[PDB]
Design a binder for this molecule. Structure first.
Ligand SMILES: CCCCCCCCCCCC[N+](C)(C)[O-]
Ligand SMILES: CCCCCCCCCCCC[N+](C)(C)[O-]
Length: 412
């Protein structure tokens, strides 16, 4: 999925996030399917983080004749996570979890010649969840949850070398020599803002027996109405001449309004304890990116200041993986998973460098005694190399990523 993230559990990172919401070895999953809450007999707690280490690269040459090579344009990332699960009654349970389901970080140098389309793009998301569940009979459980998302975002763009490109094409003369005076790192657009968003989630859990069980779950859409600073160092004169360029302010910071839709996600999952020391778990996540059509930043007067058309479309994430319950102490796991890109080639962009991803993964849990247990997980996910045609340039891009992750567990 585009700029989506599934690292709520390092326990689950070991399995390619397969069967999640269906598995429940640790408190880690009640945030995935707040139905699992019914699975715990006592207060359980989990905490840790996932180090995401990408390696995305851009390659290509611009008509001006300057490289559009961009080495490692996706910073590392420390995505933490905390969850709590406790029983209220022999029929009700609640829980809370701090996790991040959405984020990005595609950061180009301020002097990249393709600057207009590859500046900086950040998006941090914190999702505080509070949900509860109730068990009808020994077969199914129902759960509803409330999320207060806190998003932090910031978009920047610059005049690539467009200047010299424009100033060339025009070969009203000083009108050229001037746009040749513009430098590579000219704040062509700056946006930023901190805002809260709200959403809900529900999950159903039909469990055939203590060793087999399935689940259907939903995470609502989540809109974020940003009200933040916006500006463009280009001269106001550059305006109203039909250019696709973004509204100029000459340095002036004008209040800006933008809205970010955070795709709903449907997920079906299954978990089986086939053998005393083996269990298999698969899932099929559906993330509706159709909800994320564009990025439009408006003024107080509702007029457009910035607007990039994304046009993503619904996508999915299939996942298969297993766990090897060696013994009271040692536990292992591995999984494969494949998730489809929302971005249709013809919209693909170096900003949201995205292509179909393949998941290979392996993990391990050591439990010192009954209450404690540490989790360690490794995941490597490669993907397809694709051609990107944006604005006046034609880039090429490739992406591979490593993700390591620890997590501690404890139950009273
Ligand atoms: C503050 C968060 C920064 C996020 C860094 C983005 C890394 C994107 C790399 C693809 C990883 C996607 N995955 C694992 C979440 O599914
Ligand atoms: C003013 C804050 C706006 C929030 C920024 C949200 C960015 C989501 C990532 C979409 C990538 C940006 N894009 C379309 C310009 O390439």
């Amino acid at each position: 999925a585009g700029f989506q993230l599934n690292e709520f559990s390092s326990s689950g990172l070991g399995r390619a996030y397969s069967g999640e919401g269906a598995i429940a070895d640790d408190a880690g999953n009640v945030s995935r399917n707040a139905a699992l809450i019914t699975m715990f007999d006592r207060p359980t707690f989990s905490a840790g983080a996932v180090y995401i280490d990408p390696d995305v690269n851009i390659s290509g040459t611009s008509p001006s004749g300057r490289s559009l090579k961009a080495d490692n344009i996706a910073p590392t990332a420390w995505v933490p996570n905390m969850h709590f699960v406790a029983p209220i009654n022999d029929q009700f349970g609640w829980g809370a979890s701090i996790t991040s389901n959405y984020g990005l970080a595609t950061e180009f140098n301020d002097t990249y010649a393709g600057g207009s389309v590859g500046g900086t793009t950040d998006l941090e998301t914190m999702n505080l969840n509070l949900s509860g569940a109730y068990r009808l009979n020994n077969a199914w459980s129902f759960g509803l949850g409330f999320n207060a998302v806190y998003a932090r975002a910031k978009i920047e763009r610059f005049a690539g070398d467009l200047g010299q490109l424009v100033a060339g094409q025009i070969m009203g003369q000083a009108l050229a020599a001037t746009a040749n005076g513009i430098d590579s790192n000219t704040k062509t657009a700056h946006l930023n803002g901190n805002q809260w968003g709200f959403g809900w989630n529900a999950g159903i859990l039909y469990e055939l027996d203590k060793n087999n069980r399935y689940a259907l779950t939903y995470r609502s859409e989540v809109k974020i109405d940003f009200k933040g600073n916006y500006s463009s160092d280009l001269n106001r004169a550059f305006n109203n001449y039909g250019l696709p360029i973004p509204t100029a302010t000459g340095g002036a910071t004008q209040s800006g309004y933008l809205t970010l839709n955070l795709p709903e996600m449907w997920e079906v999952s299954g978990y089986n304890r086939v053998d005393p020391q083996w269990a298999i778990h698969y899932s099929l996540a559906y993330t509706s990116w159709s909800q994320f059509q564009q990025l439009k930043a408006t003024s107080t007067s509702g007029d457009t200041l910035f607007q990039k058309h994304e046009g993503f479309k619904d996508a999915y994430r299939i996942a298969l993986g297993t766990t090897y319950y060696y013994d009271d102490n040692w536990t292992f796991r591995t999984g494969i998973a494949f998730d489809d890109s929302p971005v249709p080639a013809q919209n693909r962009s170096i900003s949201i460098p995205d292509q179909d991803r393949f998941w290979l993964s392996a993990g391990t849990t050591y439990a010192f005694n009954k209450d404690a247990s540490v989790d360690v997980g490794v995941s490597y996910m490669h993907g397809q190399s694709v051609k990107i045609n944006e604005g006046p340039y034609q880039f090429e891009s490739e992406g591979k990523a490593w993700l390591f992750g620890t997590n501690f567990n404890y139950a009273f």
